[PDB]
Amino acid sequence: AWTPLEPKLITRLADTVRTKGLRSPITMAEVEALMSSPLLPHDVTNLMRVILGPAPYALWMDAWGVQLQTVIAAATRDPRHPANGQGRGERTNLNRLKGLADGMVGNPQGQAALLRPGELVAITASALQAFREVARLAE
Amino acid sequence: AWTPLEPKLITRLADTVRTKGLRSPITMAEVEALMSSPLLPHDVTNLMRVILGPAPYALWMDAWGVQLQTVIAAATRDPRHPANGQGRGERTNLNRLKGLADGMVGNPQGQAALLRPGELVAITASALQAFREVARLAEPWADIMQGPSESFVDFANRLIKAVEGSDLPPSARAPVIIDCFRQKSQPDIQQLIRTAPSTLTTPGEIIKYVLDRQKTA
Amino acid sequence: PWADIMQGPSESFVDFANRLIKAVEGSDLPPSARAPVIIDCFRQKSQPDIQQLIRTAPSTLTTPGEIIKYVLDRQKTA
Amino acid sequence: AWTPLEPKLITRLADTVRTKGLRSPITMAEVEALMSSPLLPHDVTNLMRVILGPAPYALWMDAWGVQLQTVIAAATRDPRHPANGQGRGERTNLNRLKGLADGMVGNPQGQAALLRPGELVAITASALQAFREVARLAEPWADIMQGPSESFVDFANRLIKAVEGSDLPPSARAPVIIDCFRQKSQPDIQQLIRTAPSTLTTPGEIIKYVLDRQKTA
Amino acid sequence: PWADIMQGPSESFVDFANRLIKAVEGSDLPPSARAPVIIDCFRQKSQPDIQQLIRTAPSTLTTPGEIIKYVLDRQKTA
Amino acid sequence: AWTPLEPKLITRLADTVRTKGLRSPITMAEVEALMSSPLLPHDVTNLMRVILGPAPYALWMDAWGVQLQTVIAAATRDPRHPANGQGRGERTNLNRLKGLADGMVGNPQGQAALLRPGELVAITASALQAFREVARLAE
Amino acid sequence: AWTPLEPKLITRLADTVRTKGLRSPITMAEVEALMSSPLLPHDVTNLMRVILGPAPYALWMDAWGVQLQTVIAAATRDPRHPANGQGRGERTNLNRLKGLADGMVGNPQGQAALLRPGELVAITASALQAFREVARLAE
Amino acid sequence: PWADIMQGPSESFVDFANRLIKAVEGSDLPPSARAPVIIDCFRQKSQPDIQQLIRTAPSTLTTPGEIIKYVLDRQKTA
Amino acid sequence: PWADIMQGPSESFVDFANRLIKAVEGSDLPPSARAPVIIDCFRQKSQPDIQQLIRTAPSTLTTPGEIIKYVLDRQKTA
Amino acid sequence: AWTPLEPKLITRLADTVRTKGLRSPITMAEVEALMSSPLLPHDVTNLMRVILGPAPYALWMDAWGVQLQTVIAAATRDPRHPANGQGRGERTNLNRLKGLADGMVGNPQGQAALLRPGELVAITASALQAFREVARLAE
**How buried is residue H1: exposed, middle or buried, by Cβ count under 10 Å (0-12/13-18/19+)?**
exposed
Residues of E in Cβ contact (< 8 Å) with F56: 14
Nearest Cα to G85, choosing from G64, G114, G105? G114
How far apart, in whole angstroms, are the C-alpha atoms of residue J115 and residue J41? 10
Beta strands in F1-105 (DSSP E): none
Residues of F in Cβ contact (< 8 Å) with E17: 54-55
D183, closest residue in chain C (CA to CA): C77
Residues of B in Cβ contact (< 8 Å) with C21: 54-55, 58
Contacting residues for I57 by C-beta, under 8 A, at least 6 apart: B213, H58, I70
Torsion sign (Cα): J113, J115, J117, J120: negative
Nearest Cα to G134, choosing from G69, G61, G72? G61
How many inter-chain contacts (E to F, CB under 8 Å) are there? 32
Nearest Cα to B168, choosing from D168, A98, D188? D168
Asked if residue B12 and residue B42 are part of one domain, the reply reads yes
Asked if residue D64 and residue D171 are part of one domain, the reply reads no
Give one word for D107, left, alpha or beta, with left for phi > 0 and alpha for psi -120 to 50: beta
CA distances from D157 to F41, J20, J126 (A): 56, 65, 64
Among D191, D192, D193, D198, most C C-beta atoms within 10 A, so best to mutate, is: D191
User: How many C-alpha atoms does G28 have within 13 Å on its Cβ side?
Assistant: 12
CA distances from J46 to J7, J26, J57, J61, J108 (A): 11, 21, 10, 12, 11
| Run of H or E residues at B158 | helix B152-164
How far apart, in whole angstroms, are the C-alpha atoms of residue J46 and residue G111? 86
How far apart, in whole angstroms, are the C-alpha atoms of residue I68 and residue A96? 48
How far apart, in whole angstroms, are the C-alpha atoms of residue B53 and residue H48? 59
Instruction: Provide the resolution (angstroms).
Output: 7.6
Query: The domain spanning residue I60 has which CATH number?
Result: 1.10.1200.30
According to the 3-state scheme, what is the secondary structure of G100-139?
Answer: CCCCCCCCHHHHHHHCCHHHHHHHHHHHHHHHHHHHHHHC
- What is the CA angle C69-C70-C75, rounded to 5? 105
How far apart, in whole angstroms, are the C-alpha atoms of residue E4 and residue C69? 43
- B179 and D168 within 8 Å at the Cβ level: the answer is yes
How far apart, in whole angstroms, are the C-alpha atoms of residue B82 and residue B118? 5
Residue I37 dihedral angles phi and psi, to the nearest 5°: -65, -40
Neighbours of D202 (CB within 10 A): 15
- D59 and H77 within 8 Å at the Cβ level: the answer is no
How far apart, in whole angstroms, are the C-alpha atoms of residue H34 and residue H29? 7
How far apart, in whole angstroms, are the C-alpha atoms of residue E44 and residue E58? 18
Neighbours of G67 (CB within 10 A): 21
AA identity, residue E62: T
Torsion sign (Cα): H63, H66, H71, H74: negative
Q: How far is CA B1 from the centre of its chain?
A: 30
Residues of E in Cβ contact (< 8 Å) with D213: 55-57
- B56 and C14 within 8 Å at the Cβ level: the answer is yes
H49, closest residue in chain I (CA to CA): I76
CA distances from B157 to B145, B164, B201, B217, F120 (A): 12, 11, 18, 20, 74
- What is the CA angle B168-B170-B171, rounded to 5? 105
Residues of C in Cβ contact (< 8 Å) with E77: 55
Neighbours of G20 (CB within 10 A): 14
If interface means Cβ-Cβ distance under 8 Å, which residues of chain D face chain E? 188, 192, 195, 197, 213-217
Report the residue from G49, G50, G58 with minimal CB separation from D207: G58
Residues of H in Cβ contact (< 8 Å) with D53: 14, 18, 22
> DSSP letter at F91?
P
G55, closest residue in chain D (CA to CA): D157
At residue C9, the 3 state secondary structure works out as coil
Residue H9 to chain B, least CA–CA distance (Å): 19
Residue G89 to chain D, least CA–CA distance (Å): 33
| DSSP states of B161-215 | HHHHTSSS-GGGHHHHHHHHHHHSSTHHHHHHHHT-SSPP-SHHHHHHHHHHH--
Asked if residue D10 and residue D107 are part of one domain, the reply reads yes
**Do D6 and D12 contact (CB within 8 A), yes or no?**
no
**Do B23 and B15 contact (CB within 8 A), yes or no?**
no
Residue D8 to chain G, least CA–CA distance (Å): 13
How far apart, in whole angstroms, are the C-alpha atoms of residue F108 and residue F42? 6
Residues of B in Cβ contact (< 8 Å) with C2: none
Residue D44 dihedral angles phi and psi, to the nearest 5°: -65, -40
- I68 and J55 within 8 Å at the Cβ level: the answer is yes
Q: Which chains touch H (3 or more CB pairs under 8 A)?
A: B, D, I
Residue B94 to chain H, least CA–CA distance (Å): 59
Measure CA of the first residue to CA of the last residue in chain F; give whole Å: 38
**Do D56 and D81 contact (CB within 8 A), yes or no?**
no
Q: Which domain holds residue H30?
A: 2-74
- C74 and D194 within 8 Å at the Cβ level: the answer is yes
Nearest Cα to I43, choosing from I58, I31, I56? I56
AA identity, residue G123: I
User: How many C-alpha atoms does B152 have within 13 Å on its Cβ side?
Assistant: 29
**Do B182 and B209 contact (CB within 8 A), yes or no?**
no
Residue B196 to chain D, least CA–CA distance (Å): 17
Residue B4 dihedral angles phi and psi, to the nearest 5°: -75, 155
- Number of structural domains in chain G: 1
Asked if residue D16 and residue D54 are part of one domain, the reply reads yes
| DSSP states of chain H | -GGG----SS--HHHHHHHHHHHHHTSSS-GGGHHHHHHHHHHHSSTHHHHHHHHT-SSPP-SHHHHHHHHHHH----
Neighbours of J21 (CB within 10 A): 13
Neighbours of C54 (CB within 10 A): 18
Does D have 3 or more CB contacts under 8 Å with H? yes
Residue A26 to chain B, least CA–CA distance (Å): 22
B144, closest residue in chain D (CA to CA): D142
Residue B47 to chain I, least CA–CA distance (Å): 54
Residue H35 dihedral angles phi and psi, to the nearest 5°: -60, -50
Final residue of a structural domain among D106, D138, D170: D138
How far apart, in whole angstroms, are the C-alpha atoms of residue I9 and residue I45? 11
Provide the Cα torsion G27, G32, G34, G39; round to 10°: 140
Query: The domain spanning residue A109 has which CATH number?
Result: 1.10.375.10
